[PDB]
Design an enzyme around this catalytic site. Structure first.
Site, PDB file in Angstrom:
ATOM      1  N   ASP A   1     -47.917 -26.298  30.499  1.00  0.00           N
ATOM      2  CA  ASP A   1     -48.268 -25.321  29.431  1.00  0.00           C
ATOM      3  C   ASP A   1     -49.634 -24.733  29.684  1.00  0.00           C
ATOM      4  OD1 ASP A   1     -45.918 -25.913  27.453  1.00  0.00           O
ATOM      5  OD2 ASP A   1     -46.704 -27.831  27.954  1.00  0.00           O
TER       6      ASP A   1
ATOM      7  N   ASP B   1     -42.976 -29.508  32.204  1.00  0.00           N
ATOM      8  CA  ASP B   1     -43.485 -28.219  32.624  1.00  0.00           C
ATOM      9  C   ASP B   1     -44.981 -28.219  32.483  1.00  0.00           C
ATOM     10  OD1 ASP B   1     -44.037 -27.853  29.877  1.00  0.00           O
ATOM     11  OD2 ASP B   1     -42.638 -26.236  29.594  1.00  0.00           O
TER      12      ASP B   1
ATOM     13  N   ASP C   1     -45.291 -22.640  30.931  1.00  0.00           N
ATOM     14  CA  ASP C   1     -44.978 -22.243  29.584  1.00  0.00           C
ATOM     15  C   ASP C   1     -46.244 -21.583  29.020  1.00  0.00           C
ATOM     16  OD1 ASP C   1     -44.178 -21.964  26.936  1.00  0.00           O
ATOM     17  OD2 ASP C   1     -43.612 -24.049  26.684  1.00  0.00           O
TER      18      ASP C   1
ATOM     19  N   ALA D   1     -53.081 -17.731  17.979  1.00  0.00           N
ATOM     20  CA  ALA D   1     -52.758 -17.243  16.658  1.00  0.00           C
ATOM     21  C   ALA D   1     -52.285 -18.395  15.779  1.00  0.00           C
ATOM     22  CB  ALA D   1     -51.676 -16.195  16.736  1.00  0.00           C
TER      23      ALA D   1
HETATM   24  N1  LIG Z   1     -49.339 -20.423  17.849  1.00  0.00           N
HETATM   25  C1  LIG Z   1     -48.172 -20.080  16.996  1.00  0.00           C
HETATM   26  C2  LIG Z   1     -46.855 -20.615  17.652  1.00  0.00           C
HETATM   27  O1  LIG Z   1     -47.049 -22.015  17.762  1.00  0.00           O
HETATM   28  C3  LIG Z   1     -45.864 -22.742  18.151  1.00  0.00           C
HETATM   29  O2  LIG Z   1     -45.321 -22.359  19.403  1.00  0.00           O
HETATM   30  C4  LIG Z   1     -45.610 -23.167  20.548  1.00  0.00           C
HETATM   31  C5  LIG Z   1     -44.294 -23.295  21.363  1.00  0.00           C
HETATM   32  O3  LIG Z   1     -43.292 -23.886  20.466  1.00  0.00           O
HETATM   33  C6  LIG Z   1     -44.534 -24.157  22.619  1.00  0.00           C
HETATM   34  O4  LIG Z   1     -43.279 -24.221  23.329  1.00  0.00           O
HETATM   35  C7  LIG Z   1     -42.382 -25.256  22.935  1.00  0.00           C
HETATM   36  O5  LIG Z   1     -41.188 -24.631  22.457  1.00  0.00           O
HETATM   37  C8  LIG Z   1     -40.518 -23.801  23.451  1.00  0.00           C
HETATM   38  C9  LIG Z   1     -39.385 -23.198  22.601  1.00  0.00           C
HETATM   39  O6  LIG Z   1     -38.583 -24.270  22.065  1.00  0.00           O
HETATM   40  C10 LIG Z   1     -40.134 -24.688  24.668  1.00  0.00           C
HETATM   41  O7  LIG Z   1     -39.429 -23.939  25.678  1.00  0.00           O
HETATM   42  C11 LIG Z   1     -41.408 -25.299  25.268  1.00  0.00           C
HETATM   43  N2  LIG Z   1     -41.098 -26.073  26.493  1.00  0.00           N
HETATM   44  C12 LIG Z   1     -42.114 -26.152  24.194  1.00  0.00           C
HETATM   45  O8  LIG Z   1     -43.328 -26.749  24.710  1.00  0.00           O
HETATM   46  C13 LIG Z   1     -45.746 -23.684  23.466  1.00  0.00           C
HETATM   47  N3  LIG Z   1     -45.878 -24.460  24.736  1.00  0.00           N
HETATM   48  C14 LIG Z   1     -46.999 -23.686  22.562  1.00  0.00           C
HETATM   49  C15 LIG Z   1     -46.810 -22.745  21.374  1.00  0.00           C
HETATM   50  N4  LIG Z   1     -47.988 -22.834  20.476  1.00  0.00           N
HETATM   51  C16 LIG Z   1     -44.713 -22.432  17.119  1.00  0.00           C
HETATM   52  O9  LIG Z   1     -43.545 -23.223  17.499  1.00  0.00           O
HETATM   53  C17 LIG Z   1     -44.455 -20.939  17.043  1.00  0.00           C
HETATM   54  O10 LIG Z   1     -43.421 -20.648  16.051  1.00  0.00           O
HETATM   55  C18 LIG Z   1     -45.776 -20.300  16.632  1.00  0.00           C
HETATM   56  O11 LIG Z   1     -45.634 -18.892  16.627  1.00  0.00           O
HETATM   57 MG   LIG Z   2     -43.669 -26.565  27.280  1.00  0.00          MG
HETATM   58 MG   LIG Z   3     -44.863 -28.740  28.098  1.00  0.00          MG
END
Ligand SMILES: NC[C@H]1O[C@H](O[C@H]2[C@H](O)[C@@H](O[C@H]3O[C@H](CO)[C@@H](O)[C@H](N)[C@H]3O)[C@H](N)C[C@@H]2N)[C@H](O)[C@@H](O)[C@@H]1O
Ligand SMILES: [Mg+2]
Ligand SMILES: [Mg+2]
Length: 175
Positions: free
Chosen positions: A44, A42, A84, A98
């Protein structure tokens, strides 16, 4: 070339609105390296949280829609591709994700995708997210593509800096 063409379309629309957007995650690694190194699941994006409506408008204008609302951001679909999206919030002198290390959303375009300069999240911000992932899924159990992307990011930032950042993450979230 579908994802690259979409990335260029999204960023052209954002530029026209003077809306900064940062490529994140896998594509941010490739943008900083200036090379496409793998297939990406995907795209981001990190966006100014208070300007979310302008990003959604870009999505809609490209024929897409917001598909899922998450605790940290939202997922949108444009044709067969997934965006994403995570907000960053103004912290006096820059936008910041954050809880991420300072400098997560640098002002200058520090990466290149197919000849186009692009804003992209910092190496520290990229690597920081793997630390969250390691709390969710034992690294020994990770899909190889994530082991490889993490190791590539670590080589680029450098083992010393990564060891320090990991220790900071552990201290931040220590009980
Ligand atoms: N800044 C604070 C946040 O930081 C992380 O979050 C991240 C997500 O996890 C990412 O997304 C991933 O996880 C999703 C759920 O599994 C998937 O669908 C997706 N394809 C994955 O790339 C996204 N791209 C960046 C984001 N910073 C922590 O995990 C979260 O707790 C915390 O609040
Ligand atoms: Mg992603
Ligand atoms: Mg990604």
């Amino acid at each position: 070339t579908t994802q690259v063409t979409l990335i260029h379309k999204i960023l052209a629309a954002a530029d026209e609105r003077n809306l900064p957007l940062w490529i994140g995650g896998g594509w941010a690694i490739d943008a900083r390296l200036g090379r496409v190194t793998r297939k990406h699941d995907d795209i981001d994006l990190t966006f100014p949280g208070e300007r979310r409506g302008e990003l959604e408008a870009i999505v809609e204008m490209l024929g897409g829609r917001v598909m899922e609302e998450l605790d940290y951001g939202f997922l949108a679909e444009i044709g067969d591709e997934l965006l994403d999206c995570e907000p960053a919030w103004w912290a006096d002198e820059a936008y910041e994700i954050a809880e991420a290390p300072q400098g997560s959303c640098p002002e200058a375009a520090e990466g290149v995708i197919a000849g186009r300069p692009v804003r992209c999240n910092s190496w520290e911000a990229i690597i920081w997210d793997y630390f969250y992932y390691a709390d969710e899924v034992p690294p020994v159990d990770w899909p190889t593509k994530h082991i490889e992307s993490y190791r590539l990011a670590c080589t680029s930032l450098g083992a010393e800096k990564v060891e320090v950042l990991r220790a900071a993450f552990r201290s931040r979230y220590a009980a």
